[PDB]
Design an enzyme around this catalytic site. Structure first.
Site, PDB file in Angstrom:
ATOM      1  N   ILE B 271       0.819  -1.200   0.000  1.00 30.35           N
ATOM      2  CA  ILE B 271       0.000   0.000   0.000  1.00 30.35           C
ATOM      3  C   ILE B 271       0.866   1.269   0.000  1.00 30.35           C
ATOM      4  CG2 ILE B 271      -1.696   1.325   1.292  1.00 30.35           C
ATOM      5  CD1 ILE B 271      -2.901  -1.326   2.139  1.00 30.35           C
ATOM      6  N   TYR B 273       3.825   1.509  -1.106  1.00 35.42           N
ATOM      7  CA  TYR B 273       4.512   1.707  -2.377  1.00 35.42           C
ATOM      8  C   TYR B 273       3.579   2.243  -3.451  1.00 35.42           C
ATOM      9  CZ  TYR B 273       7.792   1.302  -6.204  1.00 35.42           C
ATOM     10  OH  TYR B 273       8.630   1.578  -7.259  1.00 35.42           O
ATOM     11  N   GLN B 274       2.373   1.705  -3.498  1.00 34.62           N
ATOM     12  CA  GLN B 274       1.350   2.232  -4.390  1.00 34.62           C
ATOM     13  C   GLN B 274       0.999   3.693  -4.065  1.00 34.62           C
ATOM     14  OE1 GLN B 274       0.212   1.574  -7.257  1.00 34.62           O
ATOM     15  NE2 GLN B 274      -1.113   3.378  -7.016  1.00 34.62           N
ATOM     16  N   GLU B 275       1.225   4.130  -2.822  1.00 37.09           N
ATOM     17  CA  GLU B 275       0.836   5.482  -2.427  1.00 37.09           C
ATOM     18  C   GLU B 275       1.953   6.503  -2.641  1.00 37.09           C
ATOM     19  OE1 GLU B 275      -2.216   6.181  -2.378  1.00 37.09           O
ATOM     20  OE2 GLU B 275      -2.971   6.341  -0.333  1.00 37.09           O
ATOM     21  N   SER B 276       3.189   6.149  -2.293  1.00 38.38           N
ATOM     22  CA  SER B 276       4.270   7.135  -2.316  1.00 38.38           C
ATOM     23  C   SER B 276       5.590   6.600  -2.888  1.00 38.38           C
ATOM     24  CB  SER B 276       4.514   7.691  -0.901  1.00 38.38           C
ATOM     25  OG  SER B 276       5.209   6.762  -0.086  1.00 38.38           O
TER      26      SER B 276
END
Ligand SMILES: [Cl-]
Lengths: 6, 418
Positions: B271, B273-276
């Site tokens: 999550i 990594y998908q976010e930032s």
């Protein structure tokens, strides 16, 4: 009324 | 006293509901104006343009329309228009691979759709007087976002929309292209009924001035135009690199949260990594920030005193996720529950329940991620989202969100065996 902008 | 009644369209350029509540250009602006007056804002949504105007000229109707309207005339006096707050320009849109029509008469023999009751329809109606060979369609059951989808996937050849709308949306439609400008720069304006008391109008125009001097009209045009919600999948090479370069700074944090919340720490990392891209300094003009891109409202509600602190961001974001997942209707079982929890993390529980209701009604199973995953993109289609409670939502980006978390999740699981 007439007239889809934002 | 009350209560300013403002009519608009449920659409990404105007007004729509997201994971944190009401939002959109026209919404913020009209709420910043209701604040000025000293009154509560009440949004009403119109079924379509023909309705919007009708509801506005009716005896017991709303006070003003804020909906990206291109003024029609300074006569008619029935519907009067405010000062302009945004300069746009009508462009013809086509598809990559088909031939770019160069100038107007190139429009003959192409399937064209425009919104019924729109200024773009008056534009083509006018053109049709030149070339009677011109054929175009107009619907009440589409918004601009539909039109663009239609051009993109090839169901219609051309369309005609104001430059701004393509600005906010072009990014989500990889195939569409601007053929040419069609008209000159028009200003967008609010529409009030005509017209025998100018007190409300004079206050409107005084607020749109100074908003154009204090300059939050340029603040808005940059806050709502030209970003992507869900960041695209980065591929193996980039991910592998960050796997060696970034994850080791924040892995003990991810692991310690997973302990504290009895969940797989790697899904949390996915999550993040998908976010930032595991960047604690990351931020967006949308108002999320930190390694788990949290709003202020959320970070304060998860005990996060500094969003830029990675340990706190990773704690709060993980706390948010697990909480959302605990909260799902317990008829949804794992693993599907976790995928729903991701979907909700992004799109909001509310829209997600709309997708579940739509799934069921459409004969499917509201507890299978693979079924609701297919209802989610329909939230970006008027013909479908208007039949729902919470309305428009770019749910296909929610799908790309969940797909992408899951695929990082799979890689992470594989590099951390046996
Ligand atoms: Cl899981």
């Amino acid at each position: 009324x007439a007239x889809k902008x934002x | 006293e009350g209560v300013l009644r403002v009519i608009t369209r449920n659409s990404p350029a105007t007004y729509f509901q997201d994971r944190n509540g009401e939002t959109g250009f026209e919404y913020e602006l009209a709420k910043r104006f209701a604040e000025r007056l000293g009154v509560e804002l009440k949004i009403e949504t119109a079924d379509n343009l023909d309705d919007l105007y009708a509801q506005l000229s009716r005896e017991g109707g709303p006070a003003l329309a804020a909906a990206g309207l291109t003024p029609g005339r300074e006569d008619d006096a029935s519907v009067r228009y405010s000062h302009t707050y945004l300069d746009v320009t009508p462009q013809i849109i086509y598809r990559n691979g088909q031939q770019r029509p160069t100038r107007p008469e190139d429009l003959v023999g192409k399937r064209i759709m425009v919104l019924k009751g729109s200024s773009h329809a008056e534009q083509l109606a006018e053109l049709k007087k030149q070339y009677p060979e011109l054929k175009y369609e107009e619907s009440d059951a589409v918004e601009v976002v539909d039109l663009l989808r239609m051009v993109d996937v090839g169901d219609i050849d051309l369309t005609l929309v104001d430059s701004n709308e393509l600005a906010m949306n072009q990014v989500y439609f990889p195939n569409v292209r601007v053929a040419f400008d069609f008209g000159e720069a028009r200003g967008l304006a609010w529409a009030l009924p005509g017209g025998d008391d100018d007190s409300l109008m004079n206050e409107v125009n005084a607020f749109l001035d100074q908003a154009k001097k204090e300059g939050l009209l340029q603040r808005l045009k940059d806050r709502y135009y030209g970003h992507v919600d869900v960041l695209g999948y980065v591929g193996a090479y980039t991910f592998t690199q960050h796997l060696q370069q970034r994850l080791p700074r924040y892995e003990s944090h991810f692991k310690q949260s997973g302990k504290q919340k009895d969940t797989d720490w790697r899904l949390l990392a996915a999550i993040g990594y998908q976010e930032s891209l595991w960047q604690p300094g990351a931020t967006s003009k949308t108002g999320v920030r930190g390694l788990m891109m949290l709003t202020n409202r959320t970070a304060q509600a998860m005990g996060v005193s500094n969003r830029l602190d990675p340990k706190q961001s990773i704690q709060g974001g993980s706390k948010y996720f697990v909480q959302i997942r605990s909260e799902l209707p317990e008829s949804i079982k794992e693993p599907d529950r976790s995928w729903f929890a991701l979907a909700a993390y992004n799109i909001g529980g509310a829209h997600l329940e709309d997708a579940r209701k739509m799934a069921e009604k459409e004969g499917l199973n509201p507890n299978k991620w693979l079924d609701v995953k297919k209802m989610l993109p329909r939230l970006a289609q008027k013909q479908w989202y208007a039949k729902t409670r919470y309305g428009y939502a770019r749910g296909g980006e929610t799908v790309h969100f969940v797909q992408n978390v899951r695929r990082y999740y799979d890689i992470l699981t594989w590099v951390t065996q046996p």
